[PDB]
């Protein structure tokens, strides 16, 4: 009953099971630990970062090793459009003979790989199960490096100080230039040297790379300035990927669009992209000042940025010390940027597939988009939660105020009511009218008169599609016109490739849109606005409100303030995160439902099914869920089973976890404490069991813990059931 | 970089004078015990108790390897594979083309014998109050003192004799595995070569 929460003496003195539960959930909140200083905080965070990167590299190495050992990578190379990639083998003693037979792939039961790693590794120039093994070996070596570094930087003479940790200019210069630019430069080097010849049949391994010229002229044009030579003779339109037939000699080109065979971006396009990004980031990494008297001091930049007329208060004067001294502000900024970035990855890796033969891998396309959108929602909610935490525990009004006037951040708490009221107005506006149009379509179609539907053509979005060259909406605007200056400017660089790809019905590049797209985009906007409303309200109201003008004195996460003053359930800022998680899950569900139904109709060919039935709710319920759930639920029946049996089991498992979350959310404490007391009496008053007694007094889960557990069940069930549905439906419908 | 100190003066390494002399074995033992208590206090890790137990097991296993070689040579060690219909799909190793290669029955029998011996060990582990030599160290008990580079030359059924023979057997197993890995033959093939041919005859 002691010594487990070593970091908290208050918990270690708890005589109940709450100590164990809270010991887990407070282990990473280093700022709240006993005998805590800032130096130890930054050093522990640094070591934890090292361990985390080691974990990531070990996970990647495991994926590589299991593809190399139990996969069919080599067979998939020779026939990427017919051979289904294998993730890893299965050894489960609970299998019957039927399950073994159904999951049997080649030599052993195995799982199909939906991560798209086969296409990614094939694109970057891997052709052998020994190339994957080398990658796994190297990644385990890197993990060992990172673990050694993490141990080393906790040693006495190697523990960095607060000044080093808060040295913003040095870290920015190095991160930008070194990390981004130099990693892009090295990736361009690999892309060219290995990937470009490997796509043309020439093997460039760790033996013949110092003697195989990536370009026939060989670094002469680069120093000579004749950089056009690297773009001459690109890959033809009859080039077979991985073979020298119809190949070229160029290494950096503009082509635009996709490879005619793999239906993916040109490797020479991506090498040029990464070279340009490398140059730009290396240049941008010299901005801030270091030991050589030139550069920028960001404190001065922030302080000097006050509009002269005066509408942002005193400007950004106090922001430097605010961000530097707070790890939650930086964490929130990083999480918001990462969420936007992974939303970008999801939205671009389906419209512009970058890996060979990934466009025809429909289950992996759906899985990748869903995975990245869910990660995006999680990251955004985390960014807002950490902003709220910064408000609660790191924000100092004195730093952000100069002689009564407030800086740009402190002024966000002055018109907080205006911000929240207008977020509420936008949410109500969008919800009222999107639901009104959807229900109008529902009722009108149900009454057998679909012509009375309200169908709004998304002209604004179709205008953008025409601006990028789509000649489908008869707009003749910028790139849909051959005479506009936008078209004449790039008529010789990348329009022929771009136009040939955007004006193609088999791509996902700028999918044609209609009224259903309009309505679902408005639903998405409503979801985004409502999630933002909840999170922003929790962040701004974190330090106090009218119901609790001292909420900052109770911390970020507390159960309530009691039944007084009318009742104060879910009044903390943590509860705002807890409520906004449901809205994030709902919004990501809407986004992924829209994407998956649109792409299922596109792949099956019945795009008229979406364009007609997507305007009313029953259309969704009947033609997406009810229609495509048939293959999934018949993964096992009283007659047999298929390789989709695991997905049906996961479907039911997700439903069960969802409803257990419903348990933990609807039923609150107090009802579970008295029942536990009855159980305690029963155990204490029964023979043959009195010999065994608990060391920690069994008590009901706390209010905040119960909310967390219900949210965890809700989210896990949500994710599992939707993953099972999307994967099984795609597999069982599209062969 | 220049206007500040990367490492504070208050956080600097101090040379541990407590390990002066203290040959690498003593230094390693002290470092392990200080760094990992509650597993060192149990006798686990680089400890004389663990060394003695592992030596006993290595000697018994040299005996077991000789017995296994004899059984393989003398027509024992049942033939074929396990019945998947009888023992489920967990005994199936691979399916090449329409035939299920299962775990060899000889491997199953050897695993059952090893299970017998390991069960005996587990009973002795959860029988601490009735066994002559316990597996772990009692709280308070102190680990027997390391024997050193060369244990005392005391012939017979002595602690030093068992200690020396356990070290020799463990080194022999290490050498056997190293020879098998370097050259590439089976473990029993290496033992057969190292016995002239008198085992697999």
């Amino acid at each position: 009953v002691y010594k487990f929460p070593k970091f908290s003496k208050a918990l270690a003195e708890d005589p109940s099971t709450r100590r164990i539960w809270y010991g887990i959930a407070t282990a990473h909140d280093f700022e709240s630990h006993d005998a805590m200083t800032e130096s130890k905080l930054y050093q522990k965070i640094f070591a934890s970062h090292f361990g985390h990167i080691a974990i990531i590299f070990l996970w990647t190495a495991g994926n590589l090793f299991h593809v190399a050992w139990q996969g069919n990578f080599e067979a998939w190379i020779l026939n990427p459009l017919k051979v289904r990639p294998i993730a890893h083998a299965i050894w489960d003693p609970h299998f019957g003979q039927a399950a073994y037979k159904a999951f049997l792939k080649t030599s052993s039961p195995a799982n199909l790989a939906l991560s798209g790693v086969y296409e990614w590794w094939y694109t970057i120039g891997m052709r052998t199960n020994n190339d994957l093994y080398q990658g796994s070996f190297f990644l385990i070596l890197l993990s060992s490096l990172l673990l050694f570094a993490g141990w080393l930087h906790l040693q006495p003479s190697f523990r960095p100080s607060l000044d080093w940790f808060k040295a913003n200019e040095y870290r920015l210069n190095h991160h930008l230039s070194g990390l981004f630019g130099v990693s892009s430069l090295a990736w361009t080097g690999h892309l060219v040297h290995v990937a470009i010849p490997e796509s043309r049949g020439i093997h460039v391994g760790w033996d013949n790379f110092l003697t195989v010229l990536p370009h026939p002229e060989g670094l002469t044009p680069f120093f000579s300035g004749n950089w056009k030579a690297y773009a001459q003779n690109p890959d033809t339109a009859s080039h077979i990927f991985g073979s020298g037939e119809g190949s070229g000699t160029a290494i950096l080109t503009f082509l635009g669009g996709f490879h005619p065979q793999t239906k993916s971006l040109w490797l020479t396009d991506m090498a040029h992209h990464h070279l340009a990004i490398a140059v730009l980031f290396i240049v941008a990494g010299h901005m801030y000042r270091t030991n050589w008297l030139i550069g920028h001091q960001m404190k001065l930049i922030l302080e000097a940025h006050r509009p002269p007329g005066g509408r942002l208060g005193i400007g950004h004067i106090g922001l430097y010390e605010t961000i530097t001294n707070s790890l939650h502000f930086q964490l929130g900024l990083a999480l918001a940027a990462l969420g936007v970035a992974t939303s970008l990855t999801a939205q671009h890796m389906y419209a512009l597939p970058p890996y060979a033969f990934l466009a025809s891998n429909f289950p992996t396309q759906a899985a990748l988009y869903t995975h990245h959108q869910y990660i995006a929602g999680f990251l955004m909610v985390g960014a807002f939660a950490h902003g709220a935490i910064f408000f609660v525990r790191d924000y100092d009004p004195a730093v952000n105020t100069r002689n009564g006037e407030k800086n740009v951040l402190a002024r966000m708490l002055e018109h907080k009511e205006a911000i929240i009221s207008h977020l509420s107005w936008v949410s109500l506006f969008l919800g009222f009218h999107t639901l009104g149009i959807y229900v109008h379509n529902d009722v009108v179609v149900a009454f057998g008169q679909p012509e009375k539907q309200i169908l709004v053509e998304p002209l604004f979005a179709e205008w953008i599609q025409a601006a990028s060259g789509k000649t489908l909406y008869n707009f003749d605007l910028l790139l849909a016109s051959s005479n506009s200056p936008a078209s004449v400017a790039s008529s010789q660089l990348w329009l022929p490739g771009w136009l040939s790809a955007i004006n193609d019905g088999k791509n996902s590049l700028f999918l044609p849109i209609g009224p259903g797209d309009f309505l679902v985009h408005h639903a998405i906007a409503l979801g985004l606005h409502t999630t933002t409303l909840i999170l922003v309200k929790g962040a701004l109201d974190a330090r106090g409100s009218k119901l609790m003008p001292d909420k900052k004195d109770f911390g970020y996460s507390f159960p309530c303030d009691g039944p007084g003053r009318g009742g104060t359930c879910d009044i903390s800022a943590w509860d705002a995160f807890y409520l906004a998680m449901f809205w994030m899950l709902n919004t990501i569900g809407w986004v992924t439902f829209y994407w998956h139904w649109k792409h299922l109709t596109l792949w099956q060919g019945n795009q008229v099914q979406f364009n007609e039935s997507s305007n009313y709710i029953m259309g969704w319920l009947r033609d997406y869920l009810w229609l495509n759930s048939s293959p999934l639920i018949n993964g096992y029946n009283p007659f047999g089973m298929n390789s989709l049996s695991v997905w049906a089991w996961m479907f039911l498992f997700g439903h069960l976890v969802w409803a257990t979350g419903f348990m933990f959310l609807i039923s609150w404490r107090g009802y579970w404490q008295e029942l536990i007391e009855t159980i305690v009496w029963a155990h204490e008053r029964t023979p043959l069991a009195n010999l065994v007694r608990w060391k920690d007094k069994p008590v009901a889960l706390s209010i905040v813990q119960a909310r967390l557990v219900g949210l965890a069940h809700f989210t896990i069930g949500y994710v599992l059931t939707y993953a099972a549905f999307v994967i099984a439906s795609t597999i069982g419908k599209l062969g | 970089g220049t206007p500040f100190d990367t490492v504070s003066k208050d956080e600097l390494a101090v040379e541990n004078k407590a390990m002066a002399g203290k040959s690498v074995f003593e230094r390693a033992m002290a470092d392990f015990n200080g760094r990992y208590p509650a597993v060192a206090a149990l006798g686990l890790g680089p400890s004389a108790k663990a060394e003695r137990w592992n030596g006993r097991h290595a000697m018994f296993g040299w005996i077991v390897l000789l017995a296994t070689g004899y059984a393989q040579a003398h027509g024992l060690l049942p033939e074929g594979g396990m019945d998947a219909k009888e023992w489920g799909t967990w005994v199936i190793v691979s399916t090449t083309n329409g035939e299920q290669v299962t775990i060899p029955a000889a491997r199953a029998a050897i695993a059952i014998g090893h299970l017998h011996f390991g069960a005996v060990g587990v009973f002795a582990a959860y029988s601490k109050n009735s066994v002559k030599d316990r597996l772990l160290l009692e709280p308070g008990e102190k680990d027997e003192a390391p024997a050193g580079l060369f244990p005392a030359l005391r012939p017979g059924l002595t602690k030093e004799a068992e200690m020396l023979n356990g070290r020799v057997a463990m080194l022999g197993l290490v050498a056997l595995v190293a020879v098998s890995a370097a050259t590439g033959q089976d473990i029993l093939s290496v033992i057969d070569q190292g016995l002239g041919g008198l085992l697999l005859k």
Partner: peptide, 30 residues
């Protein structure tokens, strides 16, 4: 198909990465 030697040494290297992980884990304290 990878050999027994390839998998074995990868397992051995994985063990070394494990001992480095507990050293980091124990250094981040109990």
């Amino acid at each position: 198909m990878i050999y027994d030697s390839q998998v074995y040494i990868a397992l051995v290297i994985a063990v070394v990465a494990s001992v480095l992980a507990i050293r980091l884990g124990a250094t981040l304290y109990n």
